[PDB]
Coordinates of C-alpha atoms and ligand atoms in Angstrom, one line a residue:
Chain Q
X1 CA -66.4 181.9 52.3
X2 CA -64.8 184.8 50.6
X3 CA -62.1 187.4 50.9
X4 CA -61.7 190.4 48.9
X5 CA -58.2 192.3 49.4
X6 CA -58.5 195.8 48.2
X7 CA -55.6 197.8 47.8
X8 CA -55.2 201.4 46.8
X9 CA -53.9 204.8 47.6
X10 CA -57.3 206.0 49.2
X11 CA -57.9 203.3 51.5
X12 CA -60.4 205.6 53.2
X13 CA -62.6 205.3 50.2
X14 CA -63.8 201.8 50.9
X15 CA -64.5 202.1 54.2
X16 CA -68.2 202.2 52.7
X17 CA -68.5 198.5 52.1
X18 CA -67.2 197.5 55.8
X19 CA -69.7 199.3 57.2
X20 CA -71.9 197.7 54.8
X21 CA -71.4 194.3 55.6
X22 CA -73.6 192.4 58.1
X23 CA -72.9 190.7 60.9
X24 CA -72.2 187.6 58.2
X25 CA -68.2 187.9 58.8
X26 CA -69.2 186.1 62.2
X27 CA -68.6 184.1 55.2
X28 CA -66.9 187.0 54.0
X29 CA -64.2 189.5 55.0
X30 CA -62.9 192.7 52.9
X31 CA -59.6 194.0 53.9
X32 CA -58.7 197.4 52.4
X33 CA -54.8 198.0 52.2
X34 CA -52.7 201.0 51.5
X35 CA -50.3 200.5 48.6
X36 CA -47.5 203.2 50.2
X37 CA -47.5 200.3 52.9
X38 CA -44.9 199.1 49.5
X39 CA -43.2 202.1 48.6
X40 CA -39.1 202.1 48.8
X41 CA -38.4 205.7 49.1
X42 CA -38.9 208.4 52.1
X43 CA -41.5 210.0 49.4
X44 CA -43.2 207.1 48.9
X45 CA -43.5 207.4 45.2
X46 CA -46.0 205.1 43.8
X47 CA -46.1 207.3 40.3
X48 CA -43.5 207.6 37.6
X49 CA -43.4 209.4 34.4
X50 CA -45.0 207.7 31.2
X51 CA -41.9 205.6 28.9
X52 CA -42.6 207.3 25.2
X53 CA -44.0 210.5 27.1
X54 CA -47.8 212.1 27.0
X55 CA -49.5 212.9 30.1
X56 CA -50.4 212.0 34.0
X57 CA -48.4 209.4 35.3
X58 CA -48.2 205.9 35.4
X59 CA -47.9 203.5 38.7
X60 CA -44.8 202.0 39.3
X61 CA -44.4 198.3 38.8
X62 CA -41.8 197.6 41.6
X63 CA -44.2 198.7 44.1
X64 CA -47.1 196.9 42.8
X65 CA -45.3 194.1 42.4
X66 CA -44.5 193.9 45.8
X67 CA -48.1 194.5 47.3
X68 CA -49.2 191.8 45.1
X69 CA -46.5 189.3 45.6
X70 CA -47.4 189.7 49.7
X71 CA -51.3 189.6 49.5
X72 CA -51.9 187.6 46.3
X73 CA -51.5 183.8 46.1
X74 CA -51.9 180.9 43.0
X75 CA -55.6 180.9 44.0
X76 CA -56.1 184.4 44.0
X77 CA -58.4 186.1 41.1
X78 CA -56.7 189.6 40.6
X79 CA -59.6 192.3 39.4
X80 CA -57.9 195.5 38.5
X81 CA -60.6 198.3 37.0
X82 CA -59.5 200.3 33.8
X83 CA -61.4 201.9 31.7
X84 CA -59.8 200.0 28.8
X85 CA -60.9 196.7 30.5
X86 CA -63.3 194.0 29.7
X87 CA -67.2 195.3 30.2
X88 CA -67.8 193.6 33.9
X89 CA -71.2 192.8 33.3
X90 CA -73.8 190.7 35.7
X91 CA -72.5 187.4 34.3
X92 CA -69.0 188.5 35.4
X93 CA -70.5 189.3 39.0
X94 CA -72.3 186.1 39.1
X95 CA -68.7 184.3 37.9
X96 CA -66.6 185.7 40.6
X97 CA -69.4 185.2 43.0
X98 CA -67.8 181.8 43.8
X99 CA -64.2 182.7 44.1
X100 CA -62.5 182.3 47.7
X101 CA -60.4 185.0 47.0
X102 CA -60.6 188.8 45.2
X103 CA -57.6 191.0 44.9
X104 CA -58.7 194.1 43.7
X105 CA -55.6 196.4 42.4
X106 CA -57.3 200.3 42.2
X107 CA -54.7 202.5 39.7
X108 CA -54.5 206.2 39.7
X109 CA -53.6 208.6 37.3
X110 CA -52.9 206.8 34.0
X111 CA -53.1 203.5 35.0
X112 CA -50.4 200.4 36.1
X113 CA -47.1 199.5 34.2
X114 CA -48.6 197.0 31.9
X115 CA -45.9 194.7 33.1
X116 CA -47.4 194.3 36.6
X117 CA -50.7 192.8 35.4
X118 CA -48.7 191.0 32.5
X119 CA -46.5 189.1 35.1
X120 CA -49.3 188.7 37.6
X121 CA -50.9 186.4 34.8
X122 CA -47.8 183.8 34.8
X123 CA -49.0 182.7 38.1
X124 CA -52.8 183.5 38.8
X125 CA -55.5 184.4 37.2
X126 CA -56.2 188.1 36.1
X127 CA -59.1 190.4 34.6
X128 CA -58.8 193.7 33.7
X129 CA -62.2 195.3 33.5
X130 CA -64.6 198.4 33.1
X131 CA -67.8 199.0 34.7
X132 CA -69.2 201.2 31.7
X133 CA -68.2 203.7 29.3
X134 CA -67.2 206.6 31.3
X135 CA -63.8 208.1 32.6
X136 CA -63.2 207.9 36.4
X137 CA -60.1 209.4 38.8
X138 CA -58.9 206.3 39.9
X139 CA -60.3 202.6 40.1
X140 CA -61.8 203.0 43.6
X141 CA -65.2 203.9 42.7
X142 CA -65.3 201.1 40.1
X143 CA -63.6 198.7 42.8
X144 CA -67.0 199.9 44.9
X145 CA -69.4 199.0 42.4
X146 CA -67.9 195.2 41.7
X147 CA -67.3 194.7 45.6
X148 CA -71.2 195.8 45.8
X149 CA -72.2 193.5 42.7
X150 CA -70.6 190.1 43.8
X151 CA -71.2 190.3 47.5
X152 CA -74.9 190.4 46.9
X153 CA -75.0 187.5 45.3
X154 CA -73.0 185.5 48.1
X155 CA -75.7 183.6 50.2
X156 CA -76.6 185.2 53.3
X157 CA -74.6 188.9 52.2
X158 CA -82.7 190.9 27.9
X159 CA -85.4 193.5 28.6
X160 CA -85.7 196.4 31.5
X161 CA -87.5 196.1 34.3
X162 CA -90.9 198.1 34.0
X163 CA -92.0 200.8 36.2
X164 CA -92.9 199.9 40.2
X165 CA -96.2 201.3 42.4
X166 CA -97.0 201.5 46.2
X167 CA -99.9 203.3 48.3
X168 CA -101.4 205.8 48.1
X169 CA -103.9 204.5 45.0
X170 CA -103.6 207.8 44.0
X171 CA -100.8 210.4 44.5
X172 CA -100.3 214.3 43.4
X173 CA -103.3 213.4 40.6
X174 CA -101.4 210.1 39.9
X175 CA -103.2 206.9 39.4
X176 CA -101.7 202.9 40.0
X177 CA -102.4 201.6 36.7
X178 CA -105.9 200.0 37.6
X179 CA -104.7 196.7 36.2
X180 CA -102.3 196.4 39.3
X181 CA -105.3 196.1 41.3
X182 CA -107.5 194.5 39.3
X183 CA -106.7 190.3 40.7
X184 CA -105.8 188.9 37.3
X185 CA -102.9 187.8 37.3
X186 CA -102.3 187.0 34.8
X187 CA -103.3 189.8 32.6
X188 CA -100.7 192.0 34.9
X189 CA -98.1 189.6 33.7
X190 CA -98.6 190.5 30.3
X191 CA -99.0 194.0 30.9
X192 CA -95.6 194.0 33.1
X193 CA -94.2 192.2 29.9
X194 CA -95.6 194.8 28.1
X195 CA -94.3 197.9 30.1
X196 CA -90.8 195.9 29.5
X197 CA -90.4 195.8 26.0
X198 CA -91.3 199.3 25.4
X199 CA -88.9 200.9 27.7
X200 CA -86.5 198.6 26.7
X201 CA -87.2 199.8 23.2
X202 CA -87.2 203.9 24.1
X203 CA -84.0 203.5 26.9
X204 CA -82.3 200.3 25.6
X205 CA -82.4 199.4 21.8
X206 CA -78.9 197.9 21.8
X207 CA -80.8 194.8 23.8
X208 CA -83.4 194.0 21.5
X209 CA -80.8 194.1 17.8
Chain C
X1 CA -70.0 226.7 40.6
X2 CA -71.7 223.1 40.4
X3 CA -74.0 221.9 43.6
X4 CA -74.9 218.3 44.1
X5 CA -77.8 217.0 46.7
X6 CA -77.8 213.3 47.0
X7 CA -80.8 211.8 48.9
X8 CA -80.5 208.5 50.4
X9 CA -81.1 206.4 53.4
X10 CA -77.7 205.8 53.9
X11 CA -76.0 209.0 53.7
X12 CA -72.6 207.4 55.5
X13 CA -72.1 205.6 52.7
X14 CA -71.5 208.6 50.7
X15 CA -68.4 209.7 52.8
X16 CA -65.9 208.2 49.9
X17 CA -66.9 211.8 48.0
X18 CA -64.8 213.6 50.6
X19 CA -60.1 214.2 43.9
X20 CA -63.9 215.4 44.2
X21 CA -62.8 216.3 47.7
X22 CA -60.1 218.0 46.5
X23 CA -63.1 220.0 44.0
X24 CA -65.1 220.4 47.1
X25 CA -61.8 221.7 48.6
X26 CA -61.4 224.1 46.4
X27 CA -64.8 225.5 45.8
X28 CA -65.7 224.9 42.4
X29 CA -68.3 222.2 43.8
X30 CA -70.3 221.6 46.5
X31 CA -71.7 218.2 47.7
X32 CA -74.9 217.6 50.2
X33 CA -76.0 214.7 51.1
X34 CA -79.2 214.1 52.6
X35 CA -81.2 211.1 54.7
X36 CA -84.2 210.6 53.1
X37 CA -85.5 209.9 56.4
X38 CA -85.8 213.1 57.3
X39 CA -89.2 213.4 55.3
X40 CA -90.8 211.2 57.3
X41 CA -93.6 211.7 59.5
X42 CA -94.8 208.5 61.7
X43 CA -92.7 207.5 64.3
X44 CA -91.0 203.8 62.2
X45 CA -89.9 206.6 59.5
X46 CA -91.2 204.2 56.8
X47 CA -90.0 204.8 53.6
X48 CA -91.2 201.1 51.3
X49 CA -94.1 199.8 51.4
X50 CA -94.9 196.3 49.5
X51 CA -95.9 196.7 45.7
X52 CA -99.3 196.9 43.5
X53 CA -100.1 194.1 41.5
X54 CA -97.6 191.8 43.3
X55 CA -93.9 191.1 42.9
X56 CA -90.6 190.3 45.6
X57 CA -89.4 193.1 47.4
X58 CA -90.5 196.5 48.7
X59 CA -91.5 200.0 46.7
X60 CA -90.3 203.6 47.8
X61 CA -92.9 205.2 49.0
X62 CA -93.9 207.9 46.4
X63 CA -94.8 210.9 49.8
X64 CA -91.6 210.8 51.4
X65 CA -89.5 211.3 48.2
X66 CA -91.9 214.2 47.0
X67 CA -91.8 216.2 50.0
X68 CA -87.5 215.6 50.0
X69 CA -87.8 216.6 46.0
X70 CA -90.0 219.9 46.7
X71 CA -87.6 221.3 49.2
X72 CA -84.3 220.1 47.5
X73 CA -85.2 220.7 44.0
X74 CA -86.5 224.0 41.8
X75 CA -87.4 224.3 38.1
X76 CA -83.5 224.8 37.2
X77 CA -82.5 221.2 39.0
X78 CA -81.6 218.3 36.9
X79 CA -82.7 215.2 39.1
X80 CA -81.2 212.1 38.4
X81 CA -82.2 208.5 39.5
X82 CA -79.6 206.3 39.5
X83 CA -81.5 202.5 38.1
X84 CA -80.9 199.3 36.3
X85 CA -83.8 200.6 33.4
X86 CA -82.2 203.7 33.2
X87 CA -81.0 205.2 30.0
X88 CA -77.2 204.5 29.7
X89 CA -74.7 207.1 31.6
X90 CA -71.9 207.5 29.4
X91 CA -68.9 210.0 29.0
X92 CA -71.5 211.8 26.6
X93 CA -73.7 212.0 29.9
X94 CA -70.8 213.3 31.8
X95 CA -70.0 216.0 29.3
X96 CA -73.3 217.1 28.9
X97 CA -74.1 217.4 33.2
X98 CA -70.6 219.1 33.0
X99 CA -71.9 221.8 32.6
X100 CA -75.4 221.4 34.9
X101 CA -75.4 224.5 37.6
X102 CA -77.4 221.9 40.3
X103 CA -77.9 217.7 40.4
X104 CA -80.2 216.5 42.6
X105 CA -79.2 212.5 42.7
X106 CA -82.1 210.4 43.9
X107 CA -80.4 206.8 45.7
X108 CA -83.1 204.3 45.6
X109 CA -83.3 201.0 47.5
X110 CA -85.2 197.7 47.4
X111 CA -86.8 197.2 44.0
X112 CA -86.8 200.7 43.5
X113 CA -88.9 204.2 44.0
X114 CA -92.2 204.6 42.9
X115 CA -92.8 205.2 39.0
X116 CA -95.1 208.5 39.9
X117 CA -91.9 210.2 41.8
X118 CA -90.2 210.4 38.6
X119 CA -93.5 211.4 36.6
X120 CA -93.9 214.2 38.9
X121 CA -90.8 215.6 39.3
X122 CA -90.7 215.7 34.9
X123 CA -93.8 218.2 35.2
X124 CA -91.4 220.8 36.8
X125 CA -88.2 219.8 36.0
X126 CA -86.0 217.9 33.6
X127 CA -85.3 214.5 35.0
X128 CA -83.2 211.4 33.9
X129 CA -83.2 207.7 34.7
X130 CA -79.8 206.1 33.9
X131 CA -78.0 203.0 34.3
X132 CA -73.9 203.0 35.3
X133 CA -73.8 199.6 33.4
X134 CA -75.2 196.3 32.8
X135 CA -75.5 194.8 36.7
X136 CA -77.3 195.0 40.1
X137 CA -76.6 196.7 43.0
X138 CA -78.7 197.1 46.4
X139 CA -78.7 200.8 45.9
X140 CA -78.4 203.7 44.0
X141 CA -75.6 204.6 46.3
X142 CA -72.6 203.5 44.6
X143 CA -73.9 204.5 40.9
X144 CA -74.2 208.2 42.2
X145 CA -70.6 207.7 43.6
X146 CA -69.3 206.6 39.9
X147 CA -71.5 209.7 38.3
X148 CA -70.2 212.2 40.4
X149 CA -67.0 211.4 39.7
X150 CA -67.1 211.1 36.0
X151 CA -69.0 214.4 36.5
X152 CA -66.8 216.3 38.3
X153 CA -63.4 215.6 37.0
X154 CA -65.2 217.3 33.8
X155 CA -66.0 220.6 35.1
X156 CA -64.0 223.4 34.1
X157 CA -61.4 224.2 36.7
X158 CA -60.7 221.0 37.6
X159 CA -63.5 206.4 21.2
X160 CA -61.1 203.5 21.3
X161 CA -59.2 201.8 24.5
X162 CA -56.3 202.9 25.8
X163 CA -53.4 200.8 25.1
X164 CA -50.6 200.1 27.5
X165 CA -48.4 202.5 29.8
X166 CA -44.9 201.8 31.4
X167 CA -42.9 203.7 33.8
X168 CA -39.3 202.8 35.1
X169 CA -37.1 200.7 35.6
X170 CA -36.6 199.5 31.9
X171 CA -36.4 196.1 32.0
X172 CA -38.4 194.5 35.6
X173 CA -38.1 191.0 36.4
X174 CA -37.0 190.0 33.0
X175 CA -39.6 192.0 31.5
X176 CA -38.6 195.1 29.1
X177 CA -40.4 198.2 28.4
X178 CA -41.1 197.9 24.5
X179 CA -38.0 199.6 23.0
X180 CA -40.2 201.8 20.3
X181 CA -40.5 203.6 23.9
X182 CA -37.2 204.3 24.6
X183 CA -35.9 205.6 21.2
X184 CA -37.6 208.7 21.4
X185 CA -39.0 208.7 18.0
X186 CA -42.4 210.6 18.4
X187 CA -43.6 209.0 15.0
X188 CA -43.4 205.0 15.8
X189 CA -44.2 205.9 19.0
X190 CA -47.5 207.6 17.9
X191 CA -47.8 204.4 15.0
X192 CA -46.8 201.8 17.8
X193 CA -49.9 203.3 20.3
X194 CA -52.3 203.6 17.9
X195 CA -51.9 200.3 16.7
X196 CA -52.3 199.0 20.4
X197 CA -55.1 200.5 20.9
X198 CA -56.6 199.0 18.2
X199 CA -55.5 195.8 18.9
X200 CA -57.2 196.2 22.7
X201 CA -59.9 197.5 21.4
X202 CA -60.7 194.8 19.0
X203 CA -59.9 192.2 21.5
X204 CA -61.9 193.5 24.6
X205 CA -64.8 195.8 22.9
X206 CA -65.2 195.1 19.5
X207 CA -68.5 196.9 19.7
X208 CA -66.9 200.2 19.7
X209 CA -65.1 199.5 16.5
X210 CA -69.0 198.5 15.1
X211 CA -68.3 194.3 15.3
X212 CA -69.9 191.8 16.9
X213 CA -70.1 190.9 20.8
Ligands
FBB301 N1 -59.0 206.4 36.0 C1 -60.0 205.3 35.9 N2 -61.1 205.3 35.2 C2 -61.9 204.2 35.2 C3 -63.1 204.0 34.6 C4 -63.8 202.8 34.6 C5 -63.3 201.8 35.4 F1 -63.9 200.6 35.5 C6 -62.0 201.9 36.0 C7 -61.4 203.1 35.9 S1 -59.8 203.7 36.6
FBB302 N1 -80.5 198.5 43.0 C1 -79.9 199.2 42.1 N2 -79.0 198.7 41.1 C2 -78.5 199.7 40.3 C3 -77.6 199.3 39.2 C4 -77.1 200.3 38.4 C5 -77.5 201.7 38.6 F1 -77.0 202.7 37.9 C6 -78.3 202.0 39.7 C7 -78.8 201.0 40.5 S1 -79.9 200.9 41.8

């Protein structure tokens, strides 16, 4: 049984994964929440200029603080996606897999007050992370990707993997690799093996060292 | 002028793409997205079929995605297919498809699309396999969601970590901004960032400063 609490300014952005999620809530339920449900002003600011200056904007810690002091509890693991995060890797998916409870905090222009996550961590656990090496918007595409990562590994919803075949035996002048079909098992395990290491040599060196 | 075809068999669940709505808004890009199904031609619209030589899990058929790849893509097209095995999308990668007049984004599903869709496409056009990061999805779905965006927010018209950003009020439930902030001295302010980047950067990817783990 888990629940994932998502909230960000584009709630409409992770409508994606509800309608993703099979009739298995009759073991898990997302809730997506808007974070101007928190604001304090008729604008409803949620963005405030950067303390030693530079540029975009920075989220505001009293309204943050507030979402999180209504939806997070002492048991809650709170996930907020950064680019200057730790890597969330499939160990980190598999980790969280068997947490009760997700709050995922999506920023926005430059990020969240520091002191948001920094008092968060005096009463639950928190992990600020990165899903690769790239720049995005905002965290909601990255809050997407982890949602999608640990949910398929709840029960009931070192080298590449080499290159997959189906019918037709022969395609556009494009042979299945005869071995495929050839019964011996296990001389197509070694040549899978072998398809393996040498794309993980040409695409991934960095896992071989 | 950027134009992006995404083919999937779940094309709802690339709705979240309507900041690159605000670029489709505009004009400067424009974002299709196909079902896959529509290639189809027996009445089940089957698009897997169980894999040669054995294995879990179900293979994109190589017909349907070559008859969706001849009418979506020309010789110009970069086609990109979103996979674990895939050479690593980075903000190099972003740059460099910055600056792409049309990506075709392939979404596979189950274990993945047949190894000869790729190999065919490369005879006409360039194509690239990449990987968002280092864990599994279902789909290619959400990975084309996270290159889109990295790709678009590039385009014109629209390292180390970074350290941490504060806003008002100055002191929050006990907590003060770092006063190096509020002095307005551009100097240690400049020192004071660099060196927590740094410090993040050795703490939480020590790889990009060339260490260990
Ligand atoms: N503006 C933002 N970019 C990223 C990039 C990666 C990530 F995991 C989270 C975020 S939030
Ligand atoms: N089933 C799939 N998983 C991934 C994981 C990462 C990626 F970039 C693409 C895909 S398709």
């Amino acid at each position: 049984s888990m629940k994932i609490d998502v909230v960000t300014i584009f709630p409409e952005y992770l409508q994606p994964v509800r309608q993703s999620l099979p009739g298995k809530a009759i073991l898990v339920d997302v809730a997506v929440h808007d974070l101007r449900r928190w604001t304090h002003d008729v604008h409803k600011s949620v963005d405030d200029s950067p303390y030693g200056g530079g540029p975009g904007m920075v989220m505001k810690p009293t309204v943050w603080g507030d979402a999180l002091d209504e939806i997070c509890t002492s048991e809650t693991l709170l996930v907020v996606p950064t680019p200057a995060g730790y890597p969330f890797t499939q160990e980190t998916a598999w980790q969280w897999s068997t947490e009760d409870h997700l709050v995922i905090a999506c920023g926005r222009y430059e990020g969240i007050d520091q002191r948001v996550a920094d008092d968060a961590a005096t009463r639950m656990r928190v992990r600020e992370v990165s899903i690769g090496d790239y720049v995005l918007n905002g965290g909601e595409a990255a809050a997407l990707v982890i949602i999608e990562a640990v949910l398929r590994l709840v029960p009931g919803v070192s080298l590449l993997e080499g290159p997959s075949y189906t019918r037709p035996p022969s395609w556009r002048g494009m042979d299945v690799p005869p071995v495929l079909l050839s019964g011996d098992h296990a001389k197509i395990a070694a040549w899978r093996a072998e398809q393996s290491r040498q794309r993980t040599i040409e695409r991934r060196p960095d896992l071989l060292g």
